[PDB]
Amino acid sequence: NVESFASMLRHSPLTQMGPAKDKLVIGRIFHIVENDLYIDFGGKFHCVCRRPEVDGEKYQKGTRVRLRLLDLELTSRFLGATTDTTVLEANAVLLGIQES
Amino acid sequence: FRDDACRKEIQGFLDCAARAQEARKMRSIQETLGESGSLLPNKLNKLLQRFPNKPYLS
């Protein structure tokens, strides 16, 4: 009675989410560069969001935040290209901090 | 062509050139800095070097 991969995939939160556009997700700040916050939210790629002007000092490494997802992976095919160009990061909007 | 009667206009022409002469220095400084440019072709080309167009298969 070993669970199959097809079963794991069907019942994963990422599969159950459906499309990612305009979906609220919880992220975690794992890397910070100046006012650039690198946030992991459970997907393949992280998103990079600028430090908010209000309560900027509350956003630190490990701080859990609320995001509105736009794309899991930013990719596009440009004129003459044989494959899609990927920037290797997700597109998301940082809304604020998640609190209990 | 008697400068005694045209002192006000003469000074005005000299002020315009002085302001325009400094405008040569101000624009040049901003042109190199890219204050008005969206981005500098040197800066915009380093960014494209990292994401080169691939018209071939690898």
PDB file of all heavy atoms in Angstrom, chain A residues 41-71:
ATOM      1  N   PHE A  41       7.434  30.752  -1.608  1.00  0.00           N
ATOM      2  CA  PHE A  41       6.028  30.529  -1.292  1.00  0.00           C
ATOM      3  C   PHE A  41       5.571  29.122  -1.657  1.00  0.00           C
ATOM      4  O   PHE A  41       4.367  28.889  -1.795  1.00  0.00           O
ATOM      5  CB  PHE A  41       5.148  31.567  -1.993  1.00  0.00           C
ATOM      6  CG  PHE A  41       5.265  31.555  -3.487  1.00  0.00           C
ATOM      7  CD1 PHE A  41       4.484  30.704  -4.249  1.00  0.00           C
ATOM      8  CD2 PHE A  41       6.152  32.398  -4.131  1.00  0.00           C
ATOM      9  CE1 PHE A  41       4.588  30.694  -5.622  1.00  0.00           C
ATOM     10  CE2 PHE A  41       6.259  32.391  -5.503  1.00  0.00           C
ATOM     11  CZ  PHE A  41       5.477  31.539  -6.251  1.00  0.00           C
ATOM     12  N   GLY A  42       6.498  28.181  -1.817  1.00  0.00           N
ATOM     13  CA  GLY A  42       6.150  26.803  -2.087  1.00  0.00           C
ATOM     14  C   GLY A  42       6.207  26.390  -3.541  1.00  0.00           C
ATOM     15  O   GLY A  42       5.942  25.221  -3.841  1.00  0.00           O
ATOM     16  N   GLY A  43       6.542  27.302  -4.452  1.00  0.00           N
ATOM     17  CA  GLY A  43       6.614  26.996  -5.862  1.00  0.00           C
ATOM     18  C   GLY A  43       8.019  26.617  -6.298  1.00  0.00           C
ATOM     19  O   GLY A  43       8.934  26.441  -5.493  1.00  0.00           O
ATOM     20  N   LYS A  44       8.177  26.476  -7.614  1.00  0.00           N
ATOM     21  CA  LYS A  44       9.490  26.173  -8.170  1.00  0.00           C
ATOM     22  C   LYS A  44      10.448  27.341  -7.970  1.00  0.00           C
ATOM     23  O   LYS A  44      11.592  27.153  -7.543  1.00  0.00           O
ATOM     24  CB  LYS A  44       9.363  25.831  -9.654  1.00  0.00           C
ATOM     25  CG  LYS A  44      10.662  25.407 -10.313  1.00  0.00           C
ATOM     26  CD  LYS A  44      10.453  25.092 -11.783  1.00  0.00           C
ATOM     27  CE  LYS A  44      11.760  24.770 -12.478  1.00  0.00           C
ATOM     28  NZ  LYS A  44      12.364  23.516 -11.972  1.00  0.00           N
ATOM     29  N   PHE A  45       9.993  28.553  -8.266  1.00  0.00           N
ATOM     30  CA  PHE A  45      10.825  29.742  -8.223  1.00  0.00           C
ATOM     31  C   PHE A  45      10.353  30.693  -7.133  1.00  0.00           C
ATOM     32  O   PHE A  45       9.160  30.784  -6.832  1.00  0.00           O
ATOM     33  CB  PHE A  45      10.805  30.474  -9.565  1.00  0.00           C
ATOM     34  CG  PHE A  45      11.368  29.678 -10.696  1.00  0.00           C
ATOM     35  CD1 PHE A  45      10.540  29.156 -11.668  1.00  0.00           C
ATOM     36  CD2 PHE A  45      12.728  29.461 -10.792  1.00  0.00           C
ATOM     37  CE1 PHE A  45      11.058  28.427 -12.710  1.00  0.00           C
ATOM     38  CE2 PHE A  45      13.251  28.734 -11.833  1.00  0.00           C
ATOM     39  CZ  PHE A  45      12.415  28.217 -12.793  1.00  0.00           C
ATOM     40  N   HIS A  46      11.310  31.401  -6.544  1.00  0.00           N
ATOM     41  CA  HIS A  46      10.989  32.467  -5.614  1.00  0.00           C
ATOM     42  C   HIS A  46      10.506  33.701  -6.369  1.00  0.00           C
ATOM     43  O   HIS A  46      10.662  33.822  -7.586  1.00  0.00           O
ATOM     44  CB  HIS A  46      12.207  32.825  -4.762  1.00  0.00           C
ATOM     45  CG  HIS A  46      13.390  33.282  -5.558  1.00  0.00           C
ATOM     46  ND1 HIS A  46      14.557  32.554  -5.642  1.00  0.00           N
ATOM     47  CD2 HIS A  46      13.587  34.393  -6.307  1.00  0.00           C
ATOM     48  CE1 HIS A  46      15.421  33.195  -6.405  1.00  0.00           C
ATOM     49  NE2 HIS A  46      14.858  34.314  -6.824  1.00  0.00           N
ATOM     50  N   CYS A  47       9.900  34.620  -5.627  1.00  0.00           N
ATOM     51  CA  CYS A  47       9.572  35.943  -6.127  1.00  0.00           C
ATOM     52  C   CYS A  47      10.457  36.970  -5.433  1.00  0.00           C
ATOM     53  O   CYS A  47      10.947  36.742  -4.324  1.00  0.00           O
ATOM     54  CB  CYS A  47       8.096  36.277  -5.896  1.00  0.00           C
ATOM     55  SG  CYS A  47       7.604  36.311  -4.164  1.00  0.00           S
ATOM     56  N   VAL A  48      10.673  38.098  -6.103  1.00  0.00           N
ATOM     57  CA  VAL A  48      11.478  39.191  -5.570  1.00  0.00           C
ATOM     58  C   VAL A  48      10.579  40.412  -5.454  1.00  0.00           C
ATOM     59  O   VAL A  48      10.064  40.909  -6.464  1.00  0.00           O
ATOM     60  CB  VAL A  48      12.699  39.489  -6.454  1.00  0.00           C
ATOM     61  CG1 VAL A  48      13.573  40.552  -5.806  1.00  0.00           C
ATOM     62  CG2 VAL A  48      13.490  38.219  -6.711  1.00  0.00           C
ATOM     63  N   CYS A  49      10.390  40.891  -4.229  1.00  0.00           N
ATOM     64  CA  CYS A  49       9.518  42.019  -3.942  1.00  0.00           C
ATOM     65  C   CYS A  49      10.294  43.090  -3.190  1.00  0.00           C
ATOM     66  O   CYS A  49      11.102  42.780  -2.310  1.00  0.00           O
ATOM     67  CB  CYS A  49       8.307  41.576  -3.119  1.00  0.00           C
ATOM     68  SG  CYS A  49       7.174  40.481  -4.005  1.00  0.00           S
ATOM     69  N   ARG A  50      10.044  44.349  -3.540  1.00  0.00           N
ATOM     70  CA  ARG A  50      10.702  45.462  -2.868  1.00  0.00           C
ATOM     71  C   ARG A  50      10.148  45.663  -1.463  1.00  0.00           C
ATOM     72  O   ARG A  50       8.957  45.473  -1.212  1.00  0.00           O
ATOM     73  CB  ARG A  50      10.537  46.742  -3.684  1.00  0.00           C
ATOM     74  CG  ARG A  50      11.352  46.749  -4.965  1.00  0.00           C
ATOM     75  CD  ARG A  50      11.622  48.158  -5.457  1.00  0.00           C
ATOM     76  NE  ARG A  50      12.379  48.944  -4.485  1.00  0.00           N
ATOM     77  CZ  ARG A  50      13.686  48.824  -4.275  1.00  0.00           C
ATOM     78  NH1 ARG A  50      14.396  47.932  -4.952  1.00  0.00           N
ATOM     79  NH2 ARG A  50      14.284  49.589  -3.372  1.00  0.00           N
ATOM     80  N   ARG A  51      11.028  46.046  -0.545  1.00  0.00           N
ATOM     81  CA  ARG A  51      10.622  46.289   0.831  1.00  0.00           C
ATOM     82  C   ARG A  51       9.528  47.354   0.874  1.00  0.00           C
ATOM     83  O   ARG A  51       9.710  48.443   0.313  1.00  0.00           O
ATOM     84  CB  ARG A  51      11.820  46.734   1.665  1.00  0.00           C
ATOM     85  CG  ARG A  51      11.547  46.818   3.154  1.00  0.00           C
ATOM     86  CD  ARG A  51      12.706  47.466   3.882  1.00  0.00           C
ATOM     87  NE  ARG A  51      13.938  46.697   3.740  1.00  0.00           N
ATOM     88  CZ  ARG A  51      14.222  45.599   4.433  1.00  0.00           C
ATOM     89  NH1 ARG A  51      13.364  45.125   5.325  1.00  0.00           N
ATOM     90  NH2 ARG A  51      15.370  44.968   4.234  1.00  0.00           N
ATOM     91  N   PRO A  52       8.388  47.089   1.515  1.00  0.00           N
ATOM     92  CA  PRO A  52       7.349  48.120   1.616  1.00  0.00           C
ATOM     93  C   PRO A  52       7.827  49.341   2.386  1.00  0.00           C
ATOM     94  O   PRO A  52       8.655  49.252   3.294  1.00  0.00           O
ATOM     95  CB  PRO A  52       6.214  47.400   2.352  1.00  0.00           C
ATOM     96  CG  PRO A  52       6.404  45.980   1.976  1.00  0.00           C
ATOM     97  CD  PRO A  52       7.894  45.797   2.019  1.00  0.00           C
ATOM     98  N   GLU A  53       7.287  50.501   2.001  1.00  0.00           N
ATOM     99  CA  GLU A  53       7.666  51.752   2.648  1.00  0.00           C
ATOM    100  C   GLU A  53       7.224  51.785   4.107  1.00  0.00           C
ATOM    101  O   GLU A  53       7.943  52.305   4.969  1.00  0.00           O
ATOM    102  CB  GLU A  53       7.069  52.932   1.885  1.00  0.00           C
ATOM    103  CG  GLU A  53       7.620  53.100   0.480  1.00  0.00           C
ATOM    104  CD  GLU A  53       6.813  54.079  -0.349  1.00  0.00           C
ATOM    105  OE1 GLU A  53       6.295  55.062   0.222  1.00  0.00           O
ATOM    106  OE2 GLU A  53       6.693  53.861  -1.573  1.00  0.00           O
ATOM    107  N   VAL A  54       6.048  51.241   4.404  1.00  0.00           N
ATOM    108  CA  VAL A  54       5.504  51.248   5.757  1.00  0.00           C
ATOM    109  C   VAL A  54       5.927  49.975   6.476  1.00  0.00           C
ATOM    110  O   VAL A  54       5.753  48.866   5.955  1.00  0.00           O
ATOM    111  CB  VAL A  54       3.973  51.387   5.735  1.00  0.00           C
ATOM    112  CG1 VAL A  54       3.557  52.593   4.906  1.00  0.00           C
ATOM    113  CG2 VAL A  54       3.321  50.122   5.198  1.00  0.00           C
ATOM    114  N   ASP A  55       6.490  50.134   7.673  1.00  0.00           N
ATOM    115  CA  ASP A  55       6.956  49.006   8.482  1.00  0.00           C
ATOM    116  C   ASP A  55       8.006  48.194   7.730  1.00  0.00           C
ATOM    117  O   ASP A  55       8.019  46.963   7.779  1.00  0.00           O
ATOM    118  CB  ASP A  55       5.788  48.115   8.910  1.00  0.00           C
ATOM    119  CG  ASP A  55       4.870  48.794   9.907  1.00  0.00           C
ATOM    120  OD1 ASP A  55       5.284  49.805  10.510  1.00  0.00           O
ATOM    121  OD2 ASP A  55       3.730  48.316  10.086  1.00  0.00           O
ATOM    122  N   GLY A  56       8.901  48.892   7.031  1.00  0.00           N
ATOM    123  CA  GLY A  56       9.933  48.204   6.275  1.00  0.00           C
ATOM    124  C   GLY A  56      10.840  47.355   7.143  1.00  0.00           C
ATOM    125  O   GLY A  56      11.320  46.308   6.702  1.00  0.00           O
ATOM    126  N   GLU A  57      11.091  47.789   8.377  1.00  0.00           N
ATOM    127  CA  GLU A  57      11.996  47.060   9.257  1.00  0.00           C
ATOM    128  C   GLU A  57      11.389  45.768   9.785  1.00  0.00           C
ATOM    129  O   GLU A  57      12.128  44.931  10.316  1.00  0.00           O
ATOM    130  CB  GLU A  57      12.420  47.949  10.431  1.00  0.00           C
ATOM    131  CG  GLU A  57      11.323  48.250  11.457  1.00  0.00           C
ATOM    132  CD  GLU A  57      10.353  49.319  10.994  1.00  0.00           C
ATOM    133  OE1 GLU A  57      10.483  49.785   9.843  1.00  0.00           O
ATOM    134  OE2 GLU A  57       9.458  49.692  11.780  1.00  0.00           O
ATOM    135  N   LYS A  58      10.075  45.583   9.656  1.00  0.00           N
ATOM    136  CA  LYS A  58       9.453  44.340  10.095  1.00  0.00           C
ATOM    137  C   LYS A  58       9.737  43.188   9.144  1.00  0.00           C
ATOM    138  O   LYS A  58       9.578  42.027   9.536  1.00  0.00           O
ATOM    139  CB  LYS A  58       7.944  44.535  10.243  1.00  0.00           C
ATOM    140  CG  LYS A  58       7.556  45.449  11.392  1.00  0.00           C
ATOM    141  CD  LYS A  58       6.106  45.252  11.800  1.00  0.00           C
ATOM    142  CE  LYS A  58       5.782  45.997  13.085  1.00  0.00           C
ATOM    143  NZ  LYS A  58       6.064  47.455  12.978  1.00  0.00           N
ATOM    144  N   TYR A  59      10.153  43.476   7.914  1.00  0.00           N
ATOM    145  CA  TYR A  59      10.430  42.447   6.919  1.00  0.00           C
ATOM    146  C   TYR A  59      11.884  42.014   7.060  1.00  0.00           C
ATOM    147  O   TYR A  59      12.799  42.740   6.660  1.00  0.00           O
ATOM    148  CB  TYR A  59      10.143  42.970   5.515  1.00  0.00           C
ATOM    149  CG  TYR A  59       8.693  43.326   5.299  1.00  0.00           C
ATOM    150  CD1 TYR A  59       8.218  44.595   5.595  1.00  0.00           C
ATOM    151  CD2 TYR A  59       7.797  42.391   4.809  1.00  0.00           C
ATOM    152  CE1 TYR A  59       6.892  44.923   5.403  1.00  0.00           C
ATOM    153  CE2 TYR A  59       6.469  42.709   4.613  1.00  0.00           C
ATOM    154  CZ  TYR A  59       6.022  43.975   4.914  1.00  0.00           C
ATOM    155  OH  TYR A  59       4.700  44.296   4.720  1.00  0.00           O
ATOM    156  N   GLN A  60      12.095  40.830   7.626  1.00  0.00           N
ATOM    157  CA  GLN A  60      13.424  40.296   7.868  1.00  0.00           C
ATOM    158  C   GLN A  60      13.471  38.850   7.396  1.00  0.00           C
ATOM    159  O   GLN A  60      12.449  38.252   7.049  1.00  0.00           O
ATOM    160  CB  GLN A  60      13.798  40.383   9.354  1.00  0.00           C
ATOM    161  CG  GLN A  60      13.786  41.798   9.911  1.00  0.00           C
ATOM    162  CD  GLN A  60      14.809  42.697   9.246  1.00  0.00           C
ATOM    163  OE1 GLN A  60      15.820  42.227   8.727  1.00  0.00           O
ATOM    164  NE2 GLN A  60      14.549  43.999   9.257  1.00  0.00           N
ATOM    165  N   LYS A  61      14.677  38.289   7.382  1.00  0.00           N
ATOM    166  CA  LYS A  61      14.842  36.900   6.979  1.00  0.00           C
ATOM    167  C   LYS A  61      14.023  35.993   7.884  1.00  0.00           C
ATOM    168  O   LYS A  61      14.156  36.030   9.110  1.00  0.00           O
ATOM    169  CB  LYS A  61      16.317  36.505   7.024  1.00  0.00           C
ATOM    170  CG  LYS A  61      16.971  36.428   5.657  1.00  0.00           C
ATOM    171  CD  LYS A  61      18.484  36.365   5.758  1.00  0.00           C
ATOM    172  CE  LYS A  61      18.964  34.947   6.005  1.00  0.00           C
ATOM    173  NZ  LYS A  61      20.434  34.889   6.233  1.00  0.00           N
ATOM    174  N   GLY A  62      13.174  35.174   7.272  1.00  0.00           N
ATOM    175  CA  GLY A  62      12.280  34.298   7.992  1.00  0.00           C
ATOM    176  C   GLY A  62      10.886  34.851   8.188  1.00  0.00           C
ATOM    177  O   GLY A  62       9.980  34.086   8.537  1.00  0.00           O
ATOM    178  N   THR A  63      10.685  36.147   7.968  1.00  0.00           N
ATOM    179  CA  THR A  63       9.373  36.742   8.169  1.00  0.00           C
ATOM    180  C   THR A  63       8.399  36.201   7.133  1.00  0.00           C
ATOM    181  O   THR A  63       8.677  36.218   5.931  1.00  0.00           O
ATOM    182  CB  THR A  63       9.455  38.264   8.073  1.00  0.00           C
ATOM    183  OG1 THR A  63      10.208  38.776   9.177  1.00  0.00           O
ATOM    184  CG2 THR A  63       8.066  38.880   8.084  1.00  0.00           C
ATOM    185  N   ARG A  64       7.255  35.721   7.601  1.00  0.00           N
ATOM    186  CA  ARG A  64       6.237  35.170   6.725  1.00  0.00           C
ATOM    187  C   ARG A  64       5.304  36.283   6.273  1.00  0.00           C
ATOM    188  O   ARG A  64       4.877  37.116   7.076  1.00  0.00           O
ATOM    189  CB  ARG A  64       5.475  34.061   7.446  1.00  0.00           C
ATOM    190  CG  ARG A  64       6.418  33.114   8.176  1.00  0.00           C
ATOM    191  CD  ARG A  64       5.967  31.670   8.161  1.00  0.00           C
ATOM    192  NE  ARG A  64       7.068  30.785   8.535  1.00  0.00           N
ATOM    193  CZ  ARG A  64       6.946  29.481   8.757  1.00  0.00           C
ATOM    194  NH1 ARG A  64       5.764  28.892   8.653  1.00  0.00           N
ATOM    195  NH2 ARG A  64       8.011  28.763   9.093  1.00  0.00           N
ATOM    196  N   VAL A  65       4.991  36.294   4.977  1.00  0.00           N
ATOM    197  CA  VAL A  65       4.297  37.409   4.349  1.00  0.00           C
ATOM    198  C   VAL A  65       3.176  36.880   3.468  1.00  0.00           C
ATOM    199  O   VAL A  65       3.131  35.700   3.116  1.00  0.00           O
ATOM    200  CB  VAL A  65       5.253  38.290   3.514  1.00  0.00           C
ATOM    201  CG1 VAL A  65       6.291  38.945   4.408  1.00  0.00           C
ATOM    202  CG2 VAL A  65       5.929  37.468   2.426  1.00  0.00           C
ATOM    203  N   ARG A  66       2.265  37.781   3.112  1.00  0.00           N
ATOM    204  CA  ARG A  66       1.148  37.470   2.234  1.00  0.00           C
ATOM    205  C   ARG A  66       1.447  37.995   0.837  1.00  0.00           C
ATOM    206  O   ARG A  66       1.877  39.140   0.678  1.00  0.00           O
ATOM    207  CB  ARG A  66      -0.146  38.090   2.761  1.00  0.00           C
ATOM    208  CG  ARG A  66      -0.516  37.647   4.165  1.00  0.00           C
ATOM    209  CD  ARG A  66      -1.916  38.100   4.541  1.00  0.00           C
ATOM    210  NE  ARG A  66      -2.310  39.317   3.835  1.00  0.00           N
ATOM    211  CZ  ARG A  66      -1.974  40.548   4.208  1.00  0.00           C
ATOM    212  NH1 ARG A  66      -1.231  40.745   5.289  1.00  0.00           N
ATOM    213  NH2 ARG A  66      -2.383  41.589   3.498  1.00  0.00           N
ATOM    214  N   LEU A  67       1.216  37.154  -0.166  1.00  0.00           N
ATOM    215  CA  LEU A  67       1.477  37.491  -1.554  1.00  0.00           C
ATOM    216  C   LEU A  67       0.219  37.255  -2.373  1.00  0.00           C
ATOM    217  O   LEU A  67      -0.594  36.388  -2.049  1.00  0.00           O
ATOM    218  CB  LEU A  67       2.617  36.648  -2.138  1.00  0.00           C
ATOM    219  CG  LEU A  67       3.959  36.649  -1.412  1.00  0.00           C
ATOM    220  CD1 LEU A  67       4.811  35.514  -1.933  1.00  0.00           C
ATOM    221  CD2 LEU A  67       4.665  37.976  -1.591  1.00  0.00           C
ATOM    222  N   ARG A  68       0.069  38.034  -3.438  1.00  0.00           N
ATOM    223  CA  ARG A  68      -0.929  37.780  -4.470  1.00  0.00           C
ATOM    224  C   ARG A  68      -0.174  37.334  -5.713  1.00  0.00           C
ATOM    225  O   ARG A  68       0.538  38.132  -6.332  1.00  0.00           O
ATOM    226  CB  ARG A  68      -1.774  39.018  -4.754  1.00  0.00           C
ATOM    227  CG  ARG A  68      -2.936  38.742  -5.689  1.00  0.00           C
ATOM    228  CD  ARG A  68      -3.829  39.954  -5.861  1.00  0.00           C
ATOM    229  NE  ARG A  68      -3.201  40.980  -6.693  1.00  0.00           N
ATOM    230  CZ  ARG A  68      -2.798  42.174  -6.263  1.00  0.00           C
ATOM    231  NH1 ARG A  68      -2.949  42.535  -4.995  1.00  0.00           N
ATOM    232  NH2 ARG A  68      -2.242  43.020  -7.118  1.00  0.00           N
ATOM    233  N   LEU A  69      -0.326  36.067  -6.078  1.00  0.00           N
ATOM    234  CA  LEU A  69       0.438  35.512  -7.180  1.00  0.00           C
ATOM    235  C   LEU A  69      -0.093  36.010  -8.517  1.00  0.00           C
ATOM    236  O   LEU A  69      -1.293  36.231  -8.695  1.00  0.00           O
ATOM    237  CB  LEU A  69       0.397  33.985  -7.150  1.00  0.00           C
ATOM    238  CG  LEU A  69       1.203  33.302  -6.043  1.00  0.00           C
ATOM    239  CD1 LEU A  69       1.065  31.796  -6.159  1.00  0.00           C
ATOM    240  CD2 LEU A  69       2.664  33.713  -6.096  1.00  0.00           C
ATOM    241  N   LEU A  70       0.828  36.191  -9.459  1.00  0.00           N
ATOM    242  CA  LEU A  70       0.505  36.533 -10.836  1.00  0.00           C
ATOM    243  C   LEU A  70       0.964  35.457 -11.804  1.00  0.00           C
ATOM    244  O   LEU A  70       0.204  35.065 -12.697  1.00  0.00           O
ATOM    245  CB  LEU A  70       1.138  37.884 -11.208  1.00  0.00           C
ATOM    246  CG  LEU A  70       0.847  39.040 -10.250  1.00  0.00           C
ATOM    247  CD1 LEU A  70       1.665  40.266 -10.616  1.00  0.00           C
ATOM    248  CD2 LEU A  70      -0.635  39.370 -10.245  1.00  0.00           C
ATOM    249  N   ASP A  71       2.189  34.963 -11.645  1.00  0.00           N
ATOM    250  CA  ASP A  71       2.710  33.890 -12.476  1.00  0.00           C
ATOM    251  C   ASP A  71       3.699  33.079 -11.654  1.00  0.00           C
ATOM    252  O   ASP A  71       4.491  33.642 -10.897  1.00  0.00           O
ATOM    253  CB  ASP A  71       3.388  34.451 -13.730  1.00  0.00           C
ATOM    254  CG  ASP A  71       3.395  33.468 -14.880  1.00  0.00           C
ATOM    255  OD1 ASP A  71       3.829  32.315 -14.680  1.00  0.00           O
ATOM    256  OD2 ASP A  71       2.968  33.853 -15.988  1.00  0.00           O
TER     257      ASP A  71
END
